[PDB]
Every structure is written in C-alpha cells, then in structure tokens.
Symmetry: C2
Subunit: 620 residues, 2 copies
C-alpha cells in the first residue's frame, strides 16, 4: 500500500513469530524497543521491504542484542550482540519500575532510614528515576535505577506533596540488589496535602462557565486514506508513530497548482532532556531523557472527546509492542482536527473601495505523554499560508523537595516547608529537509545596522546579511535575538519566478539553552542542548542527537561525533536539528497542579511560492 | 454611574455646545482630537466631574488651542494657545488627506513630472504621508504633508501595484500651496496588477473548506453592565476607547475569594511607529506614528459577524467626534467573545490512579484599524489562570516601490520590477500598574549560571538574580534572551502566605528594537523604540512615549524627558512602558495581500496567588 503506513498488530505478531522461530525470542528475552525502519534513500526500489528494528534485553544476565527483521520476507536480516558498558544500556522497561519499591521494602538500611523518620513502609512510594553516569565505577556495565521517596497518606493521596528529603537509594534491577542507600539527614516531611480533587482545596466549583460548542455539520475538510495519509488544504503528509519518538511526520508536501512540492521529508522530536538545577547530592544526578531513556510514545495517554480534544475529532490508535512481542493498542492516542485561527488577511482600501477579509485555519495533530510527575502535549500545526509550527505543552505536577530552613538559591518554595528545584525542559527537533527536493543548504540571516553617512543620510537604512553554512564543522550555531537571527533552508537548484532560490525560514523562540556547566556529566551526554541549531549531512544511522543507547551512556555519542565528519552540506541531503526549551523556576501558582506552559518554533515560506498561496481561499 | 463609561453622543454634543457658547468653536475651528480625561488620582472625591480634552485646529491660520471642558458643570476649565513650531503640530485631519491630490493636480511641476512618464493625472493617486522634521527649515511652524504617487488603471484597481518612483512632493495644507516637487529620475511603472479579487489572479476558489461552527447555546460566560463593564471568570475591568489610543483597558482586577484584587489600573498601546529602511531620498523621510499622528481609533473598522469575529459575539459601538464636534458612531467597532484555549492542566497519576483534565479559556477584546496601506488588529487576552496577553496582527498591503535594476540592499523584490522597502512595526504599551494597589516596584530577573566546584559538584546548579530598579535614571532597560531576562512588578507591602511579595512577570518576545542610527531624526523622535522597557513615576500629564503633539515635532518630548526627573520608583505609583515590534523584510508571499504576522507580550502571576487559582474550574 504505502511504505509509511502504521505498524499493524499483525506485523507486530509476525515479528514475534520471526524472532521466535529464529531462537531470538526465548522465554527470557524482553523487547525494550521495537519500531519500523523508514524506507531507504532511493525510493526507486519498487516492492515493499517492511523492516523492523528491535532492541532485545536479557533478564538472566546475557548480553542484549540489536536485531533487524524483515516481516515481508519473514527473515531476520541482522543480529548484533551489544557491549552496554561501551555503547550504553537499553531503554528502561515498564516491569523494572515496579522492582525498585519492592526491593527496597525489604532492605535493612532503607527500613532503618524510614524508621528514623517514623515513616510506615506501606505508605512510602519510591520514584524509579534513570541513572546518569557519575562517580560510581561499579555501575559501568550494570543496569541501574535510582529511587527517591514520597509519602502517600492514603491510596488517592498525591505523594508529590510529601517528599522524603535526605534519602536516595541506587538499585541494580537485573541482579536485583540494592547497591547503596545514602542518608544525608532528616528533613521534616511536608504535611499539607496537594489533592486538587479534594473539595476542601478546590472550594465550591465555579458555575459561571457556559458551554462553547465547536462542531462541523458537514464533517472535516481533511481526508484520511490508507490509515494514516492526510490531505488538507493543499497539504499532504503521513502521520507515523514510533514508541520512542511518538508522533512522527513523513513526506510533508504542498500542492502548488499542478505540482506536489516536498518541504520536509521527516519530522520528529528526537530527544528531550529535563535537567535539574539542585546542587544537593540527593538530586544533582537527576536528568530525564524522556525520549532516549523512557520512550515517549510508550507512555502515551488515550485522549477523551470533549476533555482532551474538542470539536470534530478523528483519532488514530497506534500499535506498540509490549515486552514480550504482543501487539498493544494505544486507543485514541492521536488527535486530529482543524481549528479556526482568526483573520488570515484583511484590507479595506480607500482608493478601490474594496473590503477584503479571509479567515485562517490550522490543522492539529497531537498526542499527550505522561512520565512520572509530568505530562507533555506534543502539537504540530499546519496553516493555510504554508506555515508549519510545533508546540510543546508542559503540565502535570512539579517534582518536589523539602524547602531548607535557611532558604535556597536553587529551589522554590511552594507551600510551608515544601520546595521545588529549578530545572529546564529541553527539546530537540529533527528536521529531515526536502525543500523542493533533497538539494538543500542553510543560510544564517542576521539583521545589519547601518551607520549614518554615505548611502545613508538621515541614518534610517538597515539591511540583512546571509552567510551559507558549507561544512558540518561550521554548522553549529547559537541564537541572537538582538540581531534577529534566523535560518533559511533553501534549494539552490529550484527558483521562483523572480529567479531566486525557494526557501523556508526558521523562527526560534530564543529561550536559553542548557545552563549546566560545560564540563558536567549532563553537558557531555546532552551536548545537543548546548546550541540552538545543528545541521548535518543525512545518513541512515544518524537518528538521535544523543545516539541510539542513551541510558547510562557516558557522552559524545550523538551530534558531537556526527559533526566531526565535516561533510559538505552546501546543496546536499541535509538534516536540521533545532534545540529549544523552558527554564522553569517554579512559582506558587504551579502548585498543586501545574497550568500549561509552552515552547516551540515555526517555519514560514521564504520565497517558496510565486505569490501569496492563499489567494484562492473563499469567504465563508 | 461609572466614571469610566464610554463617551455618549449626548456628551459629545454637550462639548460642542459648551465650546460654541464659549466662542471657542467658531465656523473656522476644527476638532483635531477630543477624548475624555481619566478620573484624578484620588478616587476619594465623590461626584462625577466628567472632563474632556480637545485639540482645536484653526483653518484661517490662527494658533491652535488645547482646551479642557467639564460637561458635568457645563463649563470650559482651561484654554491654552499653542506654539506649534515649538511643541509640535496637531494630529492630521481626515479632510486634509484629500487636499494633497487636488492641489498637486493643478501644479505645473507635478504635471510636468507625470508627463515625462506618460501618466494621466486622472489615474494618479497620491498618498498623503506625514512629514517628519528634516533639513527644510521653512517647514517649521507650518503644517506639512508629503505625497507619493501610485497609478490606478481603473476605479477598482490596486494602485499599490503601480508605484511611481523618483517622485515626491511636499504640500502646505493650511495655506494650500505645494512647497516642493522633487524628481530624481524616471523609473518604469510596474505593470502587473495586484487585484486579489480578480479571478485571473485568484484562479478557481477552493471548494474543499467545510464549515467550522462555533456557538454557545447558553450564551457567553461574561456579563456587561453599564455599557462597558465586564465580569468574566473572576476578572473585572472596563473597556474604554480613545480616538488616539483605540481600545483602552481600565481597572483590571481579579476576584481572589472574597477580595477584588487590582492588577492593572490602565493599559493601552500609547504609540506605534513604522520606520522605513530605504535610504533613497524618495522615502528616507517615511515614518508613520499611527497613534501619534494619525490617531488609531479614528480609522477603526466596523467588524462583521462570521468574517471578522466568529462565535457568540458581543459588540461595543464607540462614539467619536467628527471635525465639527458632531457625534460619530463606529458601529461594531469592538469585538468581545470567549474562546476555548486547549488544555489548562492535566495529569494521569500512577500512584493515586486519578486522571485529571481541565480546559483553558481566554476572553478576547479586539478592534481593527486601517491606515493607508496597512490594517492592524489589536487583541487583548485574559486567561483563566490569571495571565494577561496582548497581540498585534499586521496585515493589508505592503508599501511598494520600484525594484532598482542593479538590485538593492534595502528593498525586496515582490514581482517583476516591483520592490518593497524594509521596515519595522514598533509598538509601545503603557501599563499603569496597580499590583494589589499602587505601591509597586520593578525587579529585573536574570538567569545565572554557576561554575562547577564548591556548592556545585557535578556542575548542574543554576540560579536567578533579581535587581530592583529604584530611580527613574536606571529604569531604562534592554532585553537579553540569552540569560532569559524578564521583569517582575511587585507590591512590597502585600505578601502571600509564604510571606513573599505578590507579583506578576513580564515576558517579552525579544524582537529587535529600532534599527535606525542613534543620531537620526527618527531616533530622537521615537526614543522610546530604542529600549525594551522603561519605568516612570506616575503623573497625569505623562501620557505618551512621544509626548502630546507628535506631528512634525523635533524630538525628546516623551520618555527621555520624563525619565530625566530621576524620581523614586521603589514602592510607588509606577508606569511600565514596553517596547515591542516586527522587523519586516517583505517576501514574495506577502504580495499582493499580506497574510497576518504577530507580535506581543504577556504577563503571568509570579507568586500573586497563594496556590493555583484554577483549582475550582469544573470539567465540561
């Protein structure tokens, strides 16, 4: 049908079948990751060769393996044994989070820690956080997780309101042993509850809200064919889904007259880091790689009609694989609908007497993911005028700590005795560019100010400078809001009627990048977050900014290594990597449940079309 | 009733009556401006003393006058004669724009200019642009306008498509004489039409768009009392309207429990400049002060249902005064409605098993204004969580020129032989702060990075610094996106339950400010645009960043002078002035009609409330 179609339950089963028949899926193997591979560069090869990539964990202690399978031919294409102590461990497993509370419950030094605090073990919940690479040399090669405790007064209580400070415990999940229990001191456990559902806290619910009914009596303007192909207002694309990256967009093209023009080949949020700014030994190791370590698409929520998505909604229910190879369906995990977006263009002309007004619309493709305390919304927008935008919505419950008596320079106080450490939410978007084809280049555009004098008189002139990025070694860029720095991706071999290269301009929000000291562990492991834009030559194996195995890997694996190749990017098949995020100094208004905050970027046509592409929109 | 209510037709008439009876409104007087004054600082004075301010122009040649009237008592409170050659001229009059095409039509040197270009005078439209203060010493004291020609092939033709380059003419509108006609050279007149209504250009209109129906079967959630008082989701305010500033917001307060908390006293866009970056003598003088010189609210459009504002709309029809003192009604000039705004807060908790989701809503108050080629949308948003946001939407038709053969560093080409000079759209918001009262202060917050070492180990810590602005002379600030610079406005005498000052944080977009050389005419006249934030001590006569008489004034009159007073702003009655804008390098996609582009800012609660203020929102 289409080589970009969503993986079916049948295919997941066939992989389990092929892995089983080839002796790779024994009773002790666990699938840490499984996802389809994208078709190869060279769409000339006719015939579907639907391949999958599988990361197989081993519970007895044996070396894990990276396996590639071809469901079409029913064979295993390759299988490599992995040296995790070198290339990094595999993604964490759902079944492993549950082991850290169980193991520590019967640990003598943990129980002694809780006794000194008069805390009942049946009420202590332990949060299984990923472990970076720090001092501890005995963790190398071993699959570790770290726990932090939160007291839950009753089954429906928000344990986040009761952090147990001064206590951390490392645990080896494979051999199932607690490697350490560190107790720096006793901190009072914040007693105030944080139950945003308790009528005591909420007070009487407002009755002033009248309904806002959004419908489409004739149905949506977009069509879905082949399960995931979308056709909307001249736009064309395929909505894919990977258990690691979540929603992924393929073949984004625009129908310019009698021509389907490609813009972006593949787009996804390829990584996401949440570094913590608390210098305390109890949290200085805290860094979530939501995409790399936990796999974003795995924890996707099922969206509800009227609550999560309002209007005329069309859902997609992606198919994931559980740890044993059985197909698992995320029902209504993808929302799709069109939205009104105010005025698109308007002018009341005095001379002609013509009054013109046109409404704008955007299409929305979204999914939500929950990862421990936080929930994130991923939104992609396509507008009538050719603009493409991405938006991340951060919500959920802020990670808490104890607010030290003397106050703190790295923690916010949210209630009496309750703290919340400073952190960032950093995203990395992978944009496989196909601006009117694969011959693309990136130019950095700066505004330039002119001194009053020769050309200038009056001193009113100002210009713009554009330098082309030619080699990968000079494609690592920093933002500059003062000079209005932006980046244009063009195709030198495709020109508009004015005989100028077609292009698209990238507008960043210019928020701060990674604040962690340059020599820190997190700086090395998340080097991508230290710069706003990276451009690399395309390669099939260069998929993530942090590499393929992020969990407990030591650093350098992603972009810093790809970039060292110093490949030519002037008029080639390039990939743009945009770093963007939020610096969060939690405020009282964020407790007990955090209201949505947002970050993103957008891409607008820069001489792509011959004139305005929305001249043919009617007036409803 | 309420001293903030909209000026009625009756009051406008009474002013005409009082001005007439006092011999100030003779047959030769023209009202260049008329608007109510805001109540005095000291709301203790009971009894309405509804005053008005009137700028009276004189057509015979006599000195204009600034008059203050009290419609309540039926008397003229004060009347001063103005020396325009010193303090600046009055705003331009509608009846004066029409004189510049008529005068030049019978001017020998103009006709000779058009003859050399084989252009028929009955087809040449002249655009009456405001005149700054430049070389010409003979313009001082005289009321001047400058014209630029555009050919209109037929009555419904878009003349913007046919700029007549190399030609400018200055005209004295009061004595009605053409002072100069400058012809630098003949430029080919772009022949391609730009009629976005012509089916040739539009092609067949799309039929793929299905309706999006937005209704409210039970009516809106907001109430309007006293003609302009709004009560919506704990929000309280008065929607005013001034012919110069447009929509103005008064007494913005939030109902926190059994308490109506003030946040902002008065908010408006007090100035707006559109500088042009073309160094050519034909346009190097071009600078629109949309608010200062043309009066934004005067050119407000009447909004249509379904086209301009969609949903359950409630209109306000402000009353302006024509040039003779007669009440003129702008029907449906103000749109008001509430909008759904996605997810407000959401979390699916593993430990408690509780799945929480709440939708967000924003209220919208908007109006649109047309000024020559451009149309601007002014939008104010109030969200459930206490966030306040402003958004300017730029559209219309780009001002065109001839694209020089050798190309240009300050002009964009939009079609064959058709150019469009570089420019900016700069806005200035005046925020009269009343954060929980009038004892406010402004702190500039910067993110601070920490070196790996002592407190830090691991090098993961990062903080925030906050310096208070105490004297007006140190309250002139520049943005810094790299360190995440923001500004918090707090009330040192009001504290939250954690015993910390209540506040609100200002988030700017960090776009570039004025690019014009420091010593230029426009830099002096629009000094406010050279810095992102200004804070001044409140005073009744300090109303605009550019002063009271912007037209042909030489510079320094606004903020640079107010600021020199060096008044204490630490815990006083302060006013925040935020500069924000768009740098526009027109692209082909902007021709023939420009799609909406936006700028703005927002203010979010920073420890204002004791906890999240949206805990009581229900789940519809």
């Amino acid at each position: 049908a289409s080589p970009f179609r969503l993986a079916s339950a049948g295919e997941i089963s066939e992989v389990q079948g092929i892995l089983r028949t080839a002796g790779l899926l024994g009773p002790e193997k666990r699938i840490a990751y499984l996802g389809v591979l994208d078709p190869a560069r060279g769409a000339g090869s006719e015939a579907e060769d639907r391949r999958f990539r599988v990361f197989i964990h081993d519970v007895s202690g044996a070396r894990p393996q990276e396996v590639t399978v071809s469901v079409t031919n029913g064979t295993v294409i390759s299988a490599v044994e992995l040296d995790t102590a070198a290339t990094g461990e595999l993604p964490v497993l759902e079944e492993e989070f549950e082991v850290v509370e169980q193991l520590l419950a019967t640990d003598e030094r943990w129980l002694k820690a809780l006794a000194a605090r008069n805390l009942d073990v049946s009420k202590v919940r332990v949060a299984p956080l990923s472990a970076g690479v720090f001092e501890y040399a005995e963790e190398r090669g071993r699959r570790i997780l770290r726990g932090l405790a939160f007291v839950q007064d009753f089954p429906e209580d928000s344990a986040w309101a009761h952090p147990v400070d001064g206590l951390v415990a490392y645990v080896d999940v494979v051999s199932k042993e607690v490697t350490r229990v560190i107790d720096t001191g006793v901190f009072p456990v914040p007693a105030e509850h944080g139950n945003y559902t308790d009528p005591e806290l909420t007070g009487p619910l407002r009755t002033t809200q009248k309904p806002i009914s959004i419908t489409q009596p004739e149905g949506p303007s977009f069509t879905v064919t082949g399960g995931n192909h979308i056709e909307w207002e001249k736009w064309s694309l395929d909505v894919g889904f990977d258990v690691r990256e979540g929603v992924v967009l393929h073949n984004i093209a625009f129908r310019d007259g009698d021509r389907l023009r490609p813009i972006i080949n593949r787009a996804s949020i390829a990584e996401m880091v949440v570094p913590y700014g608390d210098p305390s030994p109890i949290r200085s190791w805290q860094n979530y790689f939501d995409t790399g370590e936990y796999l974003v698409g795995q924890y996707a929520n099922s969206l509800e009609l009227g609550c999560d998505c309002l209007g005329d909604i069309t859902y997609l229910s992606p198919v994931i694989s559980d740890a044993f190879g059985n197909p698992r369906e995320i029902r209504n995990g993808i929302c799709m609908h069109e939205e009104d977006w105010g005025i698109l263009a308007k002018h009341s002309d005095l001379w002609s007497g013509i009054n013109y007004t046109r409404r704008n619309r955007r299409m929305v493709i979204s999914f939500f993911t929950t990862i421990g305390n936080y929930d994130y919304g991923f939104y992609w927008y396509l507008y009538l005028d050719g603009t493409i935008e991405f938006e991340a919505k951060a919500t959920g419950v802020v990670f808490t700590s104890a607010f030290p008596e003397g106050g703190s320079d790295n923690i916010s106080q949210l209630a009496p005795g309750l703290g919340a450490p400073f952190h960032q939410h950093i995203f990395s978007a992978r944009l496989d560019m196909a601006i009117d084809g694969f011959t693309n280049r990136v130019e950095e555009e700066d505004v330039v100010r002119q001194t009053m004098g020769p050309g200038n008189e009056r001193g009113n002139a100002f210009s713009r400078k554009r330098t082309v990025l030619t080699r990968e070694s000079e494609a690592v860029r920093e933002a500059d809001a003062r000079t209005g720095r932006t980046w244009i991706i063009s195709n030198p071999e495709s020109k508009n009627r004015l005989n100028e290269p077609v292009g698209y301009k990238l507008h960043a929000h210019n928020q701060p990048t990674l604040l962690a000291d340059p020599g820190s562990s997190i700086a090395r492991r998340a080097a991508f977050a230290t710069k706003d834009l990276w451009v690399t030559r395309y390669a099939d194996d260069e998929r993530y900014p942090t590499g393929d195995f992020v969990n407990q890997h030591s650093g350098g694996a992603g972009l810093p290594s790809y970039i060292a190749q110093d490949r030519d990017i002037d008029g080639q098949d390039i990939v743009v990597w945009h770093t963007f995020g939020l610096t969060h100094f939690p405020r009282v208004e964020d407790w007990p449940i955090m209201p949505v905050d947002t970050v993103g970027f957008k891409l607008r046509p820069e001489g792509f079309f011959d004139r305005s592409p929305v001249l043919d929109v009617p007036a409803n």
